[PDB]
Amino acid sequence: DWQSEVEFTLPQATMKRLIEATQFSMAHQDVRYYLNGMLFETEGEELRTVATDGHRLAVCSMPIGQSLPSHSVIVPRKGVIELMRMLDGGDNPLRVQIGSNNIRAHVGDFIFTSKLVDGRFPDYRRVLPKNPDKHLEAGCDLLKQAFARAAILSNEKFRGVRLYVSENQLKITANNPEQEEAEEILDVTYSGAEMEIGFNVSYVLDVLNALKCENVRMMLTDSVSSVQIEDAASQSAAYVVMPMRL
Amino acid sequence: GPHMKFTVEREHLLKPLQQVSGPLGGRPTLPILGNLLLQVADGTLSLTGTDLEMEMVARVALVQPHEPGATTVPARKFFDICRGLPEGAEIAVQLEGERMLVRSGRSRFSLSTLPAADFPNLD
Amino acid sequence: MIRLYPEQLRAQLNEGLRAAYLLLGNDPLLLQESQDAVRQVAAAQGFEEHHTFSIDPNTDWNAIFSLCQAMSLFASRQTLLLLLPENGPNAAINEQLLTLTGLLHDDLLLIVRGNKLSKAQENAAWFTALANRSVQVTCQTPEQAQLPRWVAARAKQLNLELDDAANQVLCYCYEGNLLALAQALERLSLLWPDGKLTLPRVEQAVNDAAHFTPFHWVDALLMGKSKRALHILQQLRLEGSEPVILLRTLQRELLLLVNLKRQSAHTPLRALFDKHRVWQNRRGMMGEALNRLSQTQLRQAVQLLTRTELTLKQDYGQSVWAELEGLSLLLCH
Amino acid sequence: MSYQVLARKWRPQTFADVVGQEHVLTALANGLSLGRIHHAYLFSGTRGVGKTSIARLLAKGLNCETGITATPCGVCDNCREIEQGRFVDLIEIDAASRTKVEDTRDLLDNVQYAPARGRFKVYLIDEVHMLSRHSFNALLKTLEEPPEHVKFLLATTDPQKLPVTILSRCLQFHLKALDVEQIRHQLEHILNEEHIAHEPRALQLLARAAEGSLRDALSLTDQAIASGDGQVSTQAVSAMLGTLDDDQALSLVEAMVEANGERVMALINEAAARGIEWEALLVEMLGLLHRIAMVQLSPAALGNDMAAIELRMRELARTIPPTDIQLYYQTLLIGRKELPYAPDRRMGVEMTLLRALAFH
Amino acid sequence: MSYQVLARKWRPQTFADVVGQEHVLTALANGLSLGRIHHAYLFSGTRGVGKTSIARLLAKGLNCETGITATPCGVCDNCREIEQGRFVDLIEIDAASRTKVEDTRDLLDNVQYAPARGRFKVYLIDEVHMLSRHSFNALLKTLEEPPEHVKFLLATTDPQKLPVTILSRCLQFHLKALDVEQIRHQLEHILNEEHIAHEPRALQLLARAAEGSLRDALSLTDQAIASGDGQVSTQAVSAMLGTLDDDQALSLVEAMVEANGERVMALINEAAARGIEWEALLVEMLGLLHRIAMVQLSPAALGNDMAAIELRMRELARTIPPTDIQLYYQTLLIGRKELPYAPDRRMGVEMTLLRALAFHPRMPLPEP
Numbered sequence A: 001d002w003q004s005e006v007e008f009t010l011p012q013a014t015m016k017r018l019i020e021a022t023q024f025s026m027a028h029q030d031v032r033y034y035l036n037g038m039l040f041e042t043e044g045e046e047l048r049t050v051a052t053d054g055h056r057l058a059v060c061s062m063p064i065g066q067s068l069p070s071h072s073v074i075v076p077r078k079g080v081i082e083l084m085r086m087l088d089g090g091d092n093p094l095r096v097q098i099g100s101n102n103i104r105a106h107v108g109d110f111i112f113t114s115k116l117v118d119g120r121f122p123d124y125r126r127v128l129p130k131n132p133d134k135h136l137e138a139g140c141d142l143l144k145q146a147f148a149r150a151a152i153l154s155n156e157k158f159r160g161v162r163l164y165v166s167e168n169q170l171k172i173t174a175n176n177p178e179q180e181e182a183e184e185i186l187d188v189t190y191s192g193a194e195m196e197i198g199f200n201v202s203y204v205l206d207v208l209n210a211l212k213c214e215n216v217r218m219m220l221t222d223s224v225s226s227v228q229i230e231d232a233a234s235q236s237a238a239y240v241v242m243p244m245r246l
Numbered sequence B: 001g002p003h004m005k006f007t008v009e010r011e012h013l014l015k016p017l018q019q020v021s022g023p024l025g026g027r028p029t030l031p032i033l034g035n036l037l038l039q040v041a042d043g044t045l046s047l048t049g050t051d052l053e054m055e056m057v058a059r060v061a062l063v064q065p066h067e068p069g070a071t072t073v074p075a076r077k078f079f080d081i082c083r084g085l086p087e088g089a090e091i092a093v094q095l096e097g098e099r100m101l102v103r104s105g106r107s108r109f110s111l112s113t114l115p116a117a118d119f120p121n122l123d
Numbered sequence C: 001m002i003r004l005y006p007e008q009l010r011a012q013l014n015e016g017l018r019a020a021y022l023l024l025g026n027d028p029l030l031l032q033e034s035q036d037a038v039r040q041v042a043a044a045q046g047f048e049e050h051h052t053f054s055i056d057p058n059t060d061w062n063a064i065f066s067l068c069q070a071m072s073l074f075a076s077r078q079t080l081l082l083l084l085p086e087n088g089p090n091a092a093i094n095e096q097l098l099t100l101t102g103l104l105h106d107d108l109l110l111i112v113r114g115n116k117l118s119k120a121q122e123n124a125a126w127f128t129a130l131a132n133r134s135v136q137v138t139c140q141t142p143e144q145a146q147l148p149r150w151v152a153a154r155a156k157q158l159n160l161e162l163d164d165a166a167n168q169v170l171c172y173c174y175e176g177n178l179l180a181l182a183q184a185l186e187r188l189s190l191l192w193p194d195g196k197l198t199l200p201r202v203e204q205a206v207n208d209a210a211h212f213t214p215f216h217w218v219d220a221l222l223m224g225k226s227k228r229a230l231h232i233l234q235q236l237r238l239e240g241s242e243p244v245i246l247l248r249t250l251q252r253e254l255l256l257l258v259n260l261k262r263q264s265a266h267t268p269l270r271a272l273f274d275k276h277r278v279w280q281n282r283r284g285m286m287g288e289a290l291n292r293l294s295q296t297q298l299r300q301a302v303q304l305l306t307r308t309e310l311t312l313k314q315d316y317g318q319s320v321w322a323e324l325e326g327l328s329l330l331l332c333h
Numbered sequence D: 001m002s003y004q005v006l007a008r009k010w011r012p013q014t015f016a017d018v019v020g021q022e023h024v025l026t027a028l029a030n031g032l033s034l035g036r037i038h039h040a041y042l043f044s045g046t047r048g049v050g051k052t053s054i055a056r057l058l059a060k061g062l063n064c065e066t067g068i069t070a071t072p073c074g075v076c077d078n079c080r081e082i083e084q085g086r087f088v089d090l091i092e093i094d095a096a097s098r099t100k101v102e103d104t105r106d107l108l109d110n111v112q113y114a115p116a117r118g119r120f121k122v123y124l125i126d127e128v129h130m131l132s133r134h135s136f137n138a139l140l141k142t143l144e145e146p147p148e149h150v151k152f153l154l155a156t157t158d159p160q161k162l163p164v165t166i167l168s169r170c171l172q173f174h175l176k177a178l179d180v181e182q183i184r185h186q187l188e189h190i191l192n193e194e195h196i197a198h199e200p201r202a203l204q205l206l207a208r209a210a211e212g213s214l215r216d217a218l219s220l221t222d223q224a225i226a227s228g229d230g231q232v233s234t235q236a237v238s239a240m241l242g243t244l245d246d247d248q249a250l251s252l253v254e255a256m257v258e259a260n261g262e263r264v265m266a267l268i269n270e271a272a273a274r275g276i277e278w279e280a281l282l283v284e285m286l287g288l289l290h291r292i293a294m295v296q297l298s299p300a301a302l303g304n305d306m307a308a309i310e311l312r313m314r315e316l317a318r319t320i321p322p323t324d325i326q327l328y329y330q331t332l333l334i335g336r337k338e339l340p341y342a343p344d345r346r347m348g349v350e351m352t353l354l355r356a357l358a359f360h
Numbered sequence E: 001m002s003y004q005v006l007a008r009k010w011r012p013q014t015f016a017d018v019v020g021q022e023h024v025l026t027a028l029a030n031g032l033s034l035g036r037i038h039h040a041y042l043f044s045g046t047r048g049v050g051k052t053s054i055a056r057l058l059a060k061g062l063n064c065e066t067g068i069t070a071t072p073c074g075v076c077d078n079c080r081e082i083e084q085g086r087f088v089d090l091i092e093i094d095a096a097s098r099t100k101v102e103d104t105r106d107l108l109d110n111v112q113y114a115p116a117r118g119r120f121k122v123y124l125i126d127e128v129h130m131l132s133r134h135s136f137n138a139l140l141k142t143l144e145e146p147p148e149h150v151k152f153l154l155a156t157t158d159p160q161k162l163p164v165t166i167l168s169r170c171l172q173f174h175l176k177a178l179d180v181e182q183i184r185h186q187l188e189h190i191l192n193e194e195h196i197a198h199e200p201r202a203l204q205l206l207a208r209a210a211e212g213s214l215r216d217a218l219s220l221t222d223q224a225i226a227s228g229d230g231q232v233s234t235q236a237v238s239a240m241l242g243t244l245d246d247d248q249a250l251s252l253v254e255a256m257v258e259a260n261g262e263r264v265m266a267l268i269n270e271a272a273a274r275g276i277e278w279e280a281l282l283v284e285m286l287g288l289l290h291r292i293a294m295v296q297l298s299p300a301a302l303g304n305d306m307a308a309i310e311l312r313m314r315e316l317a318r319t320i321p322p323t324d325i326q327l328y329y330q331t332l333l334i335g336r337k338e339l340p341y342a343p344d345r346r347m348g349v350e351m352t353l354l355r356a357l358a359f360h361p362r363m364p365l366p367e368p
């Protein structure tokens, strides 16, 4: 017995990209039960996948070419992990079935079934900063290498880096409970006021890993608001990192 | 002055660091036994690692300008910095106060270190 | 076979080493000394090296069995020491021991060390296999009655003159701890080469290292020795023994004693003891306790024991030792 | 301007500088001089009694160019390297840190290798009673046949938890807790050498508060000097010991028995300033009364736990009839029963003591 | 604006600020002046007496850039990042997360490292009694002798749970609970410094309400300020605490003593309309009764407060023998304990008072 509220006929590589964009920013056994999963949203010809845990947000909004009614459901962490475990990089036309309570996927010769979390996912639109005035655009690989270099001495129990933004140079500074300092400098093109902003280097590195592009743009508002990260030449997926207190 | 000056490409430093990393296990009996003894003298760098039972020392010739000195640095830290640099990186390690300053282009690290004279007694 | 005591093994060992020796007892010191004597005599007679193996559920029986047929390249003779578990052998270990007994030869001075085996373990194939020529040495700890004689005899053996007061003090401080007792005798001999260990000379060089079991305290209560009972409680508490087991043994024997006292006016003490399966060595002690203890004292003891158990089992467990000392004092009036 | 801590600055360096434990020192000297040293020495005493100091001195005697002897030398290489804590093969292990059988096995893999310096490879394990049973068995197995230049030194505060079999492998020494006289004399010598003005009564108070441990005496001396600007008078030590006083229940029992209302009020106010829980105070008061009753029944009812205040307890048992003890116990029992529903318990305990005082 | 909480804003930052604890203040100042700085400290006291704050002050004094001064001297960099909560030399460690020896060993193997821009690496192991015995004996060696640059500050509420061995190798300092006068003085300081009008009676009631700590006093003062509109009054404080007007409970105990029923009924049914919880009426009556009992014990036990009704305290003490006071207190205590099972709380209080009346030692209720 099944009433398909929302039916997708979508390439399996497309949803592979969608989930891989937002899989890492997910809550594991969090107190907020509605966050222990991932939001599937449907808006016209656009499919959106949102995932957050209170410190990260990852939204991937991709057109599919087929128009569907707007909808929003939450699939638990186990279901999406199982889907990724089963999803491959082929050409089989995947078929998503969205009902009132369950998620189903016909994938070539396999069927994936799961329940849905009974809750309302938070509105991601207000999480995104509303004044993305400052822009840091730099090569993705250079940023990844610099962050990994600064995170070499960072501990698992203390993982966090401070970004000093200046006229051109971007400084990444990392400390540790052992009280030893690491510093990296980059020639990112920028124009704005000097600022200091602290984030967990693991989350930023995961965001960069999710972006397989030549360069990225970070949108910044002030020292206490969240930072957005996006492809400098595409708007298919955006990421939000909440700053840490210093 | 009291600044052990050291400068080498990472290619000639990766293998000797791994060689002297043998005795360095999980938990050393003494605290300083979890470190590496670095000595710049006579145009040569000596890397020493001991387990209070076995010692392994690797020597590398030094061509860059230097200042003689000796210091005991964290084992896995120093190895992680040395390995994490891009290929062909020119590591410049200096001694400021009680800190190893590892500089490479735009990359700067300030590691905490133990006195050289406190490394057992290899005499 | 040949069942002996530590004072007889020294004479027996000069008559020719046997195929196997079984050191049985609960006293670590007697077992250690007998094993040392056996090893020394073996070394005198040509046994150079010795091998030690503790019997564990993961015992390398193949290693030991090969050792039975393991010859000696540079060595000539060999012994083989086995350390029995605290509970003795079972089916598998006893079958392995039977095979080992079948593997004895001119060499292999098999030495077996552990605690005394039960009657069921007594009637076993391995035990009967070496039952012709093996030497068994009983190494049980001397009890309260025979401890002063034993310590006096050892002091005479160690060329040390001891007094009755010093003997009593050494028995009191190191009861059940004869390892510490021999160490104390050696320390006193070293400190005073004179050998005349007066009371002050031993009062200044001993510490309360005695070890007791709950049955020792139960017997102290039955005999009525309040001081000995309190000393046993102190030693048990310092050892960290759980008070619950003390309360359990107290409850069991106190209920038996209450039944006996209730039935005393009906049936003579002999038949009552016989029906309740009372061991002969403690029948006199329990009869003395029944004669000394009144029904009112028994009721008060039951009341105090019940209050103590209620305090313990309600997860409080606070100052249970004070209640135990109160019960000990009450039962010794 | 060093002004270092007097605890370690005054650790003994030669056996003649150790206070007390005379029989142990004689036995060690006799073993070092004429006899053959036993393959393992275990030490058992109280906190701050000298255990680790004696073990370190014995290790100094073991490794020295003068040879294995009691009083080897002064300022030698090995003796100095031990005194500075920089000696290589003087392994110092905390048993609680290495209770694991795997860590213990790794520790016991080092005995085979020869010492780096000196003669004997000395292991010094502190609080050995906390080793796991498997680790303890492994230690016994390595102690039965140690190498000819490998020796073990073990220390523990409570030897009662050690299995009896440890006596089969190592020679044990028990260090007696120092009395008031020895502690007072050693503190007097320390103060005289450090040029610290002091009074004999202050030293007596420090020694009595030490409760047998010389480390406790040294710590209290440091606190007294810190508060008194070096001038260690009787009043200063008395006041700063009163700040640390926790015998409130015993003093309450003594004063309530003596029908001293003002003393009980002052003591209960002091206990309130101490921030002590009232239910715990009342239950330990009940325990003190019960102990008095038991020691009245038989002198052996007391143990070494109350060997700090046993004099006053004996006097209370002698002077107080058992009927008064029963009445006071009943009064305190009903007071504890009614305490939760009373007003703020600071005054409920007061009024229970009032009811107790009413029986005058 | 923001008005950072009194405890957070008005935390002491100098030995000229800490009220009370004269012994530990003198010890720290004198030892720092003489340069005899022990490596292990044990601040022991009840909650909110100043162990953490005094420890931070000592850490400030040790690592002033100007020099080693008794009090935290001219607040330089190190001191001001200390007061901001930022690390210069303060490794603040909760003992609840490092009870296991597997973490204490990790703590110990990091101690042998020079501090950054500081003269010491000051360890603040709070709630130190929560460690495990294995951890205690593991850090025993480091306590006996740490590196020259490592200092240990241990703070805990119950020193009895500590093993005697670690207790030996620590300077013990016990912090007594602050008196009500000192608490009221501090609260008056705070309210004068915050430009908020205050009433002496309200401050006295707040100081009594705090059980000897200034943290509870400050939280209660913040609650009273919230109850008002930036001021504290007797009405606001009494409503916050729930304590009634002493005249009411005192008239009720007087009428119970005088053994008249009509006055008792009038007092109780007037107190019903005042919105005072009945159990607190019983608690106040019992508190008063014990107060007269203590007055009987000694004139020392009156209280600096209760002056408005002190004459009547003394008169009741003179008139009533101690046995009657004990009887009344026992009756009221039993009634309060029985109150939850009464048909109504007012019903229970009324029946308890009537029971005290019926069993009156001198004027019992007339019987048929």
Ligand SMILES: Nc1ncnc2c1ncn2[C@@H]1O[C@H](COP(=O)(O)OP(=O)(O)O)[C@@H](O)[C@H]1O
Pocket: D006, D007, D008, D010, D011, D012, D017, D018, D019, D020, D021, D045, D046, D047, D048, D049, D050, D051, D052, D053, D054, D214, D215, D218, E165
């Ligand atoms: N017999 C003693 N002679 C001299 N100092 C002692 C003695 N006993 C204890 N101490 C002092 O106490 C400090 C710690 O002593 P320690 O021997 O470690 O006690 P513990 O028995 O508890 O391990 C020593 O540095 C020393 O100053």
Ligand SMILES: Nc1ncnc2c1ncn2[C@@H]1O[C@H](COP(=O)(O)OP(=O)(O)O)[C@@H](O)[C@H]1O
Pocket: E006, E007, E008, E010, E011, E012, E017, E018, E019, E020, E021, E046, E047, E048, E049, E050, E051, E052, E053, E054, E186, E214, E215, E218
């Ligand atoms: N001696 C004191 N002087 C002034 N304020 C104090 C004192 N003791 C406690 N306080 C108040 O309590 C707050 C917290 O005190 P704190 O020192 O944390 O107590 P604790 O010893 O329990 O950690 C402080 O901000 C201060 O307002």
Ligand code: BEF
Pocket: D046, D047, D048, D049, D156, D157, E164, E165, E166, E168
């Ligand atoms: F080092 Be001791 F046992 F206090």
Ligand code: BEF
Pocket: E046, E047, E048, E049, E051, E052, E157, E215
């Ligand atoms: F540190 Be306190 F007990 F609030």
Ligand SMILES: [Mg+2]
Pocket: D051, D052, D126, D155
């Ligand atoms: Mg010790």
Ligand SMILES: [Zn+2]
Pocket: D060, D063, D064, D065, D066, D072, D073, D074, D075, D076, D077, D078, D079
């Ligand atoms: Zn020497």
Ligand SMILES: [Zn+2]
Pocket: E063, E064, E065, E066, E072, E073, E074, E075, E076, E077, E078, E079
């Ligand atoms: Zn400063």
